[PDB]
Amino acid sequence: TTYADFIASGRTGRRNAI
Amino acid sequence: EQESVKEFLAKAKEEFLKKWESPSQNTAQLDHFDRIKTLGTGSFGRVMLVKHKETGNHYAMKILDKQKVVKLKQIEHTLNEKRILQAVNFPFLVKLEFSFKDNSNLYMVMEYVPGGEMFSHLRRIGRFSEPHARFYAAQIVLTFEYLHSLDLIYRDLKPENLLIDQQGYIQVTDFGFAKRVKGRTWTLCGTPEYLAPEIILSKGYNKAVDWWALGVLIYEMAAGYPPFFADQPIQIYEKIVSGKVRFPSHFSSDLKDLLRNLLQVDLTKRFGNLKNGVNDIKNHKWFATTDWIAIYQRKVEAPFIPKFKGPGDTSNFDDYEEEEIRVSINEKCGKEFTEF
Ligand SMILES: CNS(=O)(=O)c1cccc2cnccc12
Ligand SMILES: CNS(=O)(=O)c1cccc2cnccc12
Q1: Is B43 at the interface with chain A, CB within 8 A?
Q2: DSSP summary character for residue B61
Q3: B332 Cβ neighbours under 8 A, 6+ residues apart
Q4: Is B1 touching ligand 2 by the criterion CB < 6 Å?
Q5: Where are the alpha helices (DSSP H) in chain B?
Q6: B45-52 and B33-42: which strand pairing?
Q7: What dihedral do alpha carbons B116, B119, B123, B124 form, nearest 10°?
Q8: Among residues B148, B146, B177, B150, which one has the least CA distance to residue B161?
C-alpha cells in the first residue's frame, strides 16, 4: 500500500528546509 | 451587509506598512528569561521554552547563531523573517513578543503554543478526516489571503511549522523564507515535499507557490502521507515535475478536484492564481460547508483540543539534545545584522 511504502521510507520524521 | 473582506484587508495593510517601515528593535534581553528546554530545531537554529523572570510567562525563543547564518548564506532571509514577523498580525500567525541580539546570537521570542506541532498529531493519528483537514486548511487559506495581500510570500508551509493552540486553531511559525516581493523571485528554498515545480525548475515564481504548497498540505493531512514522496529529495523532485498525482481511494470527489487544481503544474491554471484569485479556492465545492467568517473569528468548534498540562509543560513536543547558549566576549557579524 502507498501508506506502507511511506511508513517504511526515510522521510516520515520532521523534514528540514533546504 | 457583511463586513467587507476588501475593506478589512485594506486597513490591515495600513497597519502592516506602519510596522514594516518602522520595525521594532531590541525589546528585551537574554537575562530577562530562564531557559527551560528545547522545543524544536531546524536547519538554521533552535527554539527553546523560556520563562520570563518578572512575570512568569512562558515563551518560545528562537535562537540563531549569527556566524552560522552567515555561513549558510541566510543573512537577508533572517532579516526578512524578523522584519516580517514583527509587522504581521493575524489570528493564525504566531506573535513575535520580543526580539534582540547579542555578540553571538539573534533572538526572536514568540508566544508559546503548548499544544504541539500539527506534524506530531498527524503522524500519530495517521490521517485527519476530511472535515478535520478542511478546518485546518481554511485557516491556511485565510492566512495566505492575508499574507499575499501584503505582498508577502511564505514559502515554507508544512505540518512541522503549524502549531495547534488551546482552542484547536493553527498558529503558523517559521518565517525564515518569507519575503515581501511584488512580482517574481528566484530563490531555491522550501522543503522538498512542498516545492512547486517552478521552484525546482529554476523559474521565476510568485505567490502561486504557496497555493501549490497548500495542495500538498491538504493532501498530506487527508492521506497521512504527501503526494510526492521518496527516500531522497532528487526522486521527489522528479515526481513533482511529472506531475502525475494519485489519490487514496477514500478521497472525496470534491477533494480530488480541489487538489488537481492546486497541484497544477501549469501556473496559468493553478487555483489561487487565476483571475478570481483566492475566491476560486474559497468557493470550491470542497469548502462549501466552511463558514469563512466564523473561522476568522474563531467561532467554529475545533475537531481536537490538545492535552493541556501547562502552563510550561512540553509533553506535546519531542525531546531534543540540549546545547549551551554561548555568548562570545566579541561582537560577531555586527554590520550584517545592524537592522535586526
Ligand atoms: C514549530 N515548533 S517549534 O520550532 O518548537 C516553535 C517555533 C516557533 C514558535 C513556537 C511556539 N510554541 C511552541 C513551539 C514553537
Ligand atoms: C471582514 N470580516 S472578518 O470576519 O473580520 C474577516 C477578516 C479577515 C479575513 C476574512 C476572510 N473571510 C471572511 C471574513 C474575514
Answers
A1: yes
A2: E
A3: B66, B67, B103, B104
A4: no
A5: 5-21, 66-71, 75-87, 118-125, 130-149, 197-200, 208-223, 233-241, 253-262, 279-282, 292-296
A6: antiparallel
A7: 10
A8: B177
Experimental method: X-ray
Question: Which residues in chain B have their CB less than 8 angstroms from residue A7's CB?
Answer: 225
Residue B336 · residue B66 · CB < 8 Å? yes
The sheet with strand B58-65 has its strands ordered as B33-42, B45-52, B58-65, B105-111, B96-101
Cell of B57: 510567562
* Alpha-carbon gap, residue B88 to B95, rounded angstroms: 8
Q: Determine what percent of chain A falls in helix, strand and coil, rounding each to the nearest 5.
A: 35, 0, 65
| Domains of chain B, earliest start first | 1-22+117-307 (1.10.510.10), 23-116+308-340 (3.30.200.20)
What does the DSSP 8-state code read for residue B26? Answer: -
Residue type at B165?
A: D
DSSP state for residue B102 in the 8-state scheme? -
Which residue is associated with the grid cell 495547534? Answer: B164
CB B147 within 8 A of CB B80: no
> What's the rounded Cα separation, in Å, for the pair B178 and B290?
27
Give the DSSP letter string of B243-294.
------TTS-HHHHHHHHHHS-S-GGG-TTSSTTTTHHHHTSGGGTT--HHH
Pick the residue whose CA is nearest to atom 15 on ligand 1: B60
**CB B288, CB B273: distance < 8 Å:** no
Interatomic CA distance for residues A6 and A3, integer angstroms = 5
Ligand number with the minimum distance to the CA of B147: 2
CB B102 within 8 A of CB B327: yes
User: Are the CB atoms for B39 and B60 separated by under 8 Å?
Assistant: yes
